[PDB]
Symmetry: none
């Protein structure tokens, strides 16, 4: 109904985008491959299927390989839809969903008989997909050409109204998970118990999550890419960090929340100050401003928190210029969000694919691109107590400046990250995460 | 300590098998590659890791890519063990578990720094792994030679005592899952709720499962490769079929049970009668018998049930000779079980790789090989009410013989399968599943 | 094959222990004598053969005298095997059991032709055996020296996985006995019929039993060391108490069960709660705990049962404080079990041999030693109505605290003992008896 | 009542025998020790009690150690009777049996205090017992003096009218036993099953048996000291050799029978012929004939059977001269029987102890002594096909003579032995075995 309608402009929007770049590069159209299931070595099991982002761009079909889109930006889009008819599979209906009518559908019953339903002459058609050799075998010659990719990847930054609804919906699901996650941390459950409380509340499986959820207690908070889910709970609960999203129609939420168990004490106050910095950095988004500048203001804000709590025995500004903040805040402030979690385009200046330079002493910044309307961002300010980095700084001459007596008090809490998913409109911001009553 | 003691003899066995086939095929040794992480197309997210079965045949390291085993059956096996030390990950400990003692362990910090740690001259070493291009770049020319793969796959039928213990231990975990899934069925939970109770009880995540679990309610029970998990319950609970295992040290369990929701009933009775055949089929495993024959026996048994219950209006003997049983029982009785769920060597007559022909009527049978001691099997007799297969039979000259009214009564219950994991001993059968008092 | 595989580590372990103690005490090795058959005074009949425990420690040859072991913990163990070849006995083919390969076996034809095969200079060998006058005669000087006996007896508490499997296997057999014995009790069989049913089911003779079975009906249950087997049944069957085990490869089961003839009654109730105390006392075994204390914990469990059943008219705590419990429960809770029923090392705190003080309440205790993993225990809590012991309590201060009217009610039923055999693991207890599903 | 009256003559008959030898050797009397329970090496378990034959020659007390008889052959004998009073054993009744009134009974409650109930001056008393060390401690100087031993042993050959009833009561029991044994053989029971049917029917334990029953099937029959009891039955049933007795009041039976499973064939005929010969040997007992000759007569009969059946080509008498009957009949013909199975005196010429010479050909014989009245005997004529002896025969110049094709047809049946317990009278014979109609 609501989403169904917003889709019509989605198509038109893409249809145009296709026309522009097809006709510009001398192509008669694109052929976009959802992809294939990957078989495990020597085995008859498969890896969980992951759809070509460039395919699901067009429609919410994320769970079906051997699917093909042919589009030129002029003719109605033709879709080749894998619907096999074996007795061991639930024979699903012919596509009668909202997106169906917007495509010329042909049913493919066996993955090898595609070679007939694709254009006879594939000399001016671009294959957009992973399986290069499977392409060649079919007749294709042009395969993922950089101008088409660079161009398509630039305009992915600009979401249609359909996309923006999808992302809103993804956050709604995620937020529900986060509440169930939070509640089981206060009951004293294990990492494993929490992860499965989240999945339970989202009503999504481990493999539907758009990224592997990070569910950390105590020290594990500090570990940024903490994958493991400890089945037994710790002897004592101090801190809980969860970074977990959800899927809707190919679009990802991405929400991080840190919690103190005692709701009081130095760590409790540390999160609340960081929250203040987060929300502020959340509102600082506006078109015209380069994303890199918010990243510089984040280091400024952390430096302040490090000064005020006497983790570092220096004024805010001296902490920044010395390069100390990077030990406690080693990662980007955030990134574009959408079909892919770390979404495409966030480094680009123009549709050619030209790189937008990163600032000051942060040459690895994820998202540096000029903020515009219809762009969706993450805001992930972090403050961590990581041993390997604290160890590296201990060797460095800055060692004298660090209050190690304070650091050691915090190590059992691990660290903090707070992440929201923000839409930038023309004269307003839509904090999708905070608009849904998640503290 | 028990597992540890069995493991010395595991190494001795594999060293001997390795010495036999390397000598036999003119090889100086062989190099077994754990595998790599697969990056998703155009993305920075990866697929879940899946260790090379040939790698995990040696030791229970299933979570670690960029690991290499160099082995000739005479020298102490060399283990190149991936252990990166980055600040965003929890530093893993140097391998110190029971198996470490049995390998000369060198640590590998960067995957591409492996060049220096493999044999200088890879002339007569066979690479065993998925990643052929990498093998070539490193200088290997022999890769997965059929003679070696066939030999190893043949002898994988004969479990060491180490392996049988692993498999036992796997069953033990899976049963905890089965118990919890059953209880939540009888409390009127959804397919999803059930699945997540299984995960909760076994304390293993979705991707730790040896295979995608099948959690079906009522009508989904007839769908053999049912993968979906309905978040919402059906309105009325009739039947529940769960086929789900567990991992221990790289060895799978593989258990199916069917339940009726009501205490009693027609389907209730069909379950227990089917259960009676499954036990008897389980007991009919005896060395020097061709598995194929038990499959034939299964068809006889399934016929008797179809006759007795008045689903088909013929005597059991007519039902087999008319071909009717296939419609209700279309798959194999079972398979070898081990490192792989459909384990290697199961179609083999000898260690060259030569096929053992299956029975005339069912030429698509999995397990055809001569039963022997120290082999582990499944026994999955089934009776399903499958639409596409029933339709097909309504077209044939057997339509008159089917009680379509009684077939319609059962359709809401879907189908039945009951699967156990049995080790075959010299003068006894150990039914790992039933020893654990699951019912 | 399972036990065969475990044996390897067994030999290793014993070798290590031998080498440790033989070096420590300046011994070049030790000689371990199986024993001899004892002739009956003035007769040409012999007593039944009872192999030296120190001999069977190494291998399961328990029915052969004139066998010798020479070991230093380093060189391959020598076995002098007695193999007489006269027409009047069945000459079995040379040793080819799973243990053969581990020994340099030299055949002995005549027991007095052994001096040829033993070390010429016996100065630094210790003789371990009973037959001292034979030791001296062959040239031995050191015999059963305390330093060595003590060491071997201390580490006998730590069972190899082989030894644990042996002990499980003995329980398997014993349990078959207890079922048959229980059954013929309920069929109104005599003590003699029960015994012979036990032997019939265990498929072991009287002389193969690791101890003289206790098989007691009615009032005989009150007699702790009841060796008689009354051939005619009593007039009424009230109670039955069987303490009986089995042999496997030289290791002992030691199970006790008591039953009421009617399933109902007060005595019946008493069994049920004694059972519940016995189970709990079973689960209370833990590494880092003096068995001593578990003995006391029993006493207060016993008192509570006497309180709850109007046998003693005091609150639990005072009952144990007076010394009332020791009349109804006049023996130890249990003992180490292994090669010997009351296995060695039970009361030592160190491998020197020095004692482990019993609690202040009782200085009679068999087993006082600090519990650890890979140690096997009996839990024999009991409550009896012995006249003699009740007669002494009549002649003391606490005489007017007892319910003589209630005691006479129980005296037809004799008493209760409930004995299990439990292996202590690191983070679990394995109750061998109850794992086999004898109630 | 019946044997209660024959006891007084028994006592008296001994009182004389004593007086005679005590007077003659100049001793004030004898002290006869029942014995002691032997402790197992390093253990708290004991061997089963075996009573001093000399102690049980007076009365039937076979179950009780630490009993002492003081007897001079003049006064009424004294009996120290072990009667402990502890809470772990049944306290039995003060002797009130048919022998108690003939002894001045003194009660012993603790073995340690026996040197106070015995004579002050032990200088002129002989200790008769096994425990030479315990004697010295008590003060005895004379121990087991040969003149006395030889005398009592000589006269043991002459049974009192009491002793002859006892051995009649033992034979009654054994034969019930033997019937069960035969029945379960035909029913296809194992050696173990047969043995326990025997013990069940006799209502006596293994250790109550006067000797180790020999229960042999098939090829085991050829084995003379076959002690094993095979728990599983053999493939096919052919033959069955049992040699098992019983006990009454310290007096042994000793009966052997052989059977054929088919009641027809050549082996069935060989038994039948051998049992005629056996009965004819059992009738050829006459006072005044030296047993030595019966053996020779025996050897000449077996010879006949070896010529009749084509085992040996030669005629009866040549067989005997060539010495070849010692290959098929290599043991004695029989022996005196009483308190001990191979009873005392059977090699003695007179009461001094001088040995009666055995027949020239066979110095290796038990019984050589002249047959007289009141002397009980065994006749064990045997024919066996023993590989050991038949190997010694084929490597001599008598190979040619025997029929090797024929022996190989009998080897499956092993051998034959038939044994009866006969009282020799003045003008009659009393075959106690066959008088109770066992065939
Ligand atoms: Mn995130
Ligand atoms: Mn993010
Ligand atoms: Mn299966
Ligand atoms: Mn399965
Ligand atoms: Mn015990
Ligand atoms: Mn016991
Ligand atoms: Mn005999
Ligand atoms: Mn005899």
């Amino acid at each position: 109904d609501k989403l169904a309608v917003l889709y019509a402009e989605h198509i038109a929007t893409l249809q145009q985008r296709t026309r522009t770049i097809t006709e510009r590069e001398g192509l008669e159209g694109l052929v976009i491959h959802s992809g294939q299931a990957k078989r495990q070595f020597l085995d008859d099991m498969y890896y969980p299927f992951k759809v070509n982002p460039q395919f699901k761009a067009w429609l919410p079909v994320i769970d079906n390989p051997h699917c093909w889109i042919v589009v030129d930006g002029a003719s109605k889009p033709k879709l080749i839809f894998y619907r096999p008819v074996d007795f061991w599979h639930k024979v699903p209906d012919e596509p009668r969903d909202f997106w169906a009518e917007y495509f010329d559908i042909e049913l493919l019953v066996q993955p090898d008989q595609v070679e007939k339903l694709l254009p006879y002459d594939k000399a001016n058609y671009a294959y957009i997909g992973e399986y290069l050799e499977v392409a060649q075998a079919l007749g294709f010659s042009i395969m993922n050409p950089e101008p088409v990719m660079n161009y398509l990847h630039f305009h992915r930054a600009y979401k249609t109204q359909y996309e923006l609804e999808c992302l809103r919906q993804a956050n709604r699901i995620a937020v529900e998970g986060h509440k169930a996650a939070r509640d089981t941390f206060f009951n004293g459950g294990s990492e494993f118990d929490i992860q499965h409380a989240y999945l339970m509340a989202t009503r999504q499986s481990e493999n539907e999550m758009p990224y592997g959820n990070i569910v950390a207690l105590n020290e594990n908070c500090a570990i940024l890419h903490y994958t493991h889910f400890e089945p037994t709970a710790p002897h004592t609960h101090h801190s809980f960090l969860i970074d977990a999203g959800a899927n809707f129609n190919g679009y990802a939420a991405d929400i991080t929340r840190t919690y103190d168990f005692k709701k009081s004490g130095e760590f409790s106050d540390l999160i609340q100050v960081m929250t203040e910095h987060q929300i502020a950095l959340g509102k600082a988004l506006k078109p015209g401003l380069l994303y890199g500048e918010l990243h510089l203001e984040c280091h400024q804000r952390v430096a302040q928190v490090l000064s005020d709590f006497n983790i570092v025995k220096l004024p805010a500004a001296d902490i920044v210029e010395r390069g100390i903040t990077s030990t406690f805040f080693p990662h980007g402030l955030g990134h574009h969000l959408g079909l892919q979690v770390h979404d495409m385009g966030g480094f680009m200046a123009d549709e050619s694919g030209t790189h937008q330079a990163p600032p000051e002493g942060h040459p690895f910044l994820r998202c540096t691109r000029l903020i515009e309307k219809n762009q969706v961002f993450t805001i992930e300010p972090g403050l961590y107590f990581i041993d390997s980095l604290l160890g590296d700084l201990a060797q460095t001459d800055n060692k004298q400046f660090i209050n190690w007596e304070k650091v050691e008090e915090f190590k059992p809490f691990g660290g903090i990250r707070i992440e929201d998913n923000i839409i930038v409109h023309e004269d307003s911001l839509e904090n999708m995460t905070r608009d849904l009553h998640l503290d």
